């Protein structure tokens, strides 16, 4: 059914993403989401493809939807954080990088980011 097709589309997205086919990835993930709109990982993955395209607003909206579906999605915070730091919104980035560390204390990406953001906040 569509539930099963959705995971197939996700997996095709992941292959596209791994080969740097960023638009193809976006398009697979869009279809994944159209078939199953209640999966935080599908949105979080699409954010990642958008980040690579410099589509930062779209990445943010997607990380923001991923958190609605699942508050504990670590990568949604890391990725929204990155898009914000890219859009020079350093206060908002730090909040997200801080929250990722609340969920995943050892997270190396959030700790590197906090240190870099310190000298802008």
């Amino acid at each position: 059914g569509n539930m099963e097709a959705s995971e197939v589309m996700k997996e095709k997205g992941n292959a596209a993403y791994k080969g740097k086919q960023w638009n193809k990835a976006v398009n697979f993930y869009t279809e994944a989401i159209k078939l199953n709109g209640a999966n935080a990982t599908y949105y979080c993955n699409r954010a990642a493809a958008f980040l690579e395209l410099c589509c930062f607003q779209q990445a943010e909206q997607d990380c923001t939807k991923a958190m609605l579906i699942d508050k504990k999605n670590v990568k949604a915070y890391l990725r929204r954080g990155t898009a914000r730091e890219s859009l020079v919104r350093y206060k908002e980035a730090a909040a997200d990088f801080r929250h990722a560390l609340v969920l995943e204390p050892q997270n190396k990406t959030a700790k590197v980011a906090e240190k870099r953001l310190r000298k802008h906040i």
């Binding site: 992941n14 990642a48 990568k75 995943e104 997270n107 190396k108 990406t109």
Partner: peptide, 8 residues
């Protein structure tokens, strides 16, 4: 560890 460069 969540590696932000990896999709899931």
């Amino acid at each position: 560890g969540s590696k932000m460069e990896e999709v899931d």
